[PDB]
Point group: C3
Chain length 185, copies 3
């Protein structure tokens, strides 16, 4: 298991710096990865969403980008702080993370470098997640795997709302999901 | 593995006593908890939902409250009896036993101000696995007083159902654990 | 404790035409629960450019996976047998990856009329929404019924359904995760 230790330490920079708290838990079920994501926006643009005085403010992306060794790159709007393995020994204080088996699968979700035949959607997840747990504030979570340039691997969260919000913090309800990938030989 | 035996023997007090049967499965892949929930109401208020006569009949909550030992309370709207390790051990009691690594994380669950929706899961289930009969399942982790931990199933619908047995499709979810033992 | 399609598989499904379509399903077995993940791409065929302006009734596609006593896949299935197993080659127990029969029993008209239903009608269903090339514009209902088919020991039955009248669309649905409950019962019953 490799996570954003389930405490707050702002660690993620959408509009302003340390902006926000994304709690993302990855847990390695052999072949498949089981993943949980809340996102809480402390300060910044999306601490007050208003689409009367900022209509366009209808979408936030937040990006994790990884190595050959699947370590988190700066070009990620997530900070390498408080992003490690937890084993019951204070491993998360260390940060020697070289965690390639937790990585979206190349064979499943390759880089999108385009007979005429290949899968647009295989590497998308798209559902709905709810602000404050309030069913009126319908938000479209979209998850993309290994879709970004400059990286071996790349998980992309991207929330999107059509209904115009009127002085709304971006707190999102948690979201469970799975992808695959590991070491190949 | 820690479950309400996948077969039906009623265990739930909505409206009437033993009203209905809840199917819930807690499997623990390490520090994360993968869970299944279906719900069939067999006698009473929800057994023939008619909102063309009894409108307010539009919501159903079912709570499980927990101890330091991770044990179910009398204050929980599901019955104690068959709640344990799956088949083999299922009779032998879970009491003296802790069940704390199945308990939702207590640290997990515009200022230093906290999250409102961190301890929510909010989506759609379907009565009959019919698209038309849209329900909205709302879970809420560790949000009940007078208890060490809490898991809280809320099922709402906007559509006025004419003669209908609440009979929820299976829904799948995770939540962060806490696995000292 | 993992059983799949290849993450990047060769056309492994007949829907419309022979070798029609390409189903990436991954079942991983977390103890007493099967974590699952399913994409569908349709390469050639009818559902490679669905055009609901010309064929209104083309608004469903069904993929069934009928199993054995021993959890082996069946000619009857719409998923071809060649590619399957976990990432080694012989073949198969394959049962411990099988939807539990007490939860999702085979549907028999031998059912008590005292209001104690052994299961619900829908307990075995899992109904939600996937999107065709992640474009939210294109809503797709996914529908998994468990053990719902006859002439088999155990079943899995992805049905895909769309309301909206597409034009020239190639059925390529977003990945969907779900769980079902596991059969794996220790033959020895104390």
């Amino acid at each position: 298991t490799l996570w954003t230790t389930p405490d707050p330490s702002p660690n993620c920079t959408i509009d302003q710096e340390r902006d926000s708290k994304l709690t993302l838990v990855l847990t390695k079920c052999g072949s498949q990865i089981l993943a949980n994501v809340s996102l809480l926006v402390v300060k910044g643009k999306f601490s007050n969403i208003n689409n009367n005085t900022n209509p366009t403010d209808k979408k936030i992306t937040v990006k994790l980008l990884f190595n050959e060794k699947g370590v988190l790159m700066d070009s990620s709007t997530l900070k390498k702080e408080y992003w490690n393995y937890r084993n019951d020994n204070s491993t998360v204080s260390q940060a020697y993370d070289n965690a390639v088996p937790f990585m979206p699968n190349i064979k499943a979700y390759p880089k999108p470098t385009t007979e005429d035949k290949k899968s647009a959607a295989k590497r998308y997840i798209v559902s709905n997640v709810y602000i404050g747990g309030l069913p009126d504030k319908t938000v479209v979570i979209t998850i993309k795997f290994n879709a970004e340039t400059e990286c071996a691997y790349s998980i992309t969260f991207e929330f999107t709302w059509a209904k115009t919000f009127e002085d709304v913090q971006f707190d999102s309800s948690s979201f469970t999901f799975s992808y695959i990938a590991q070491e190949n030989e």
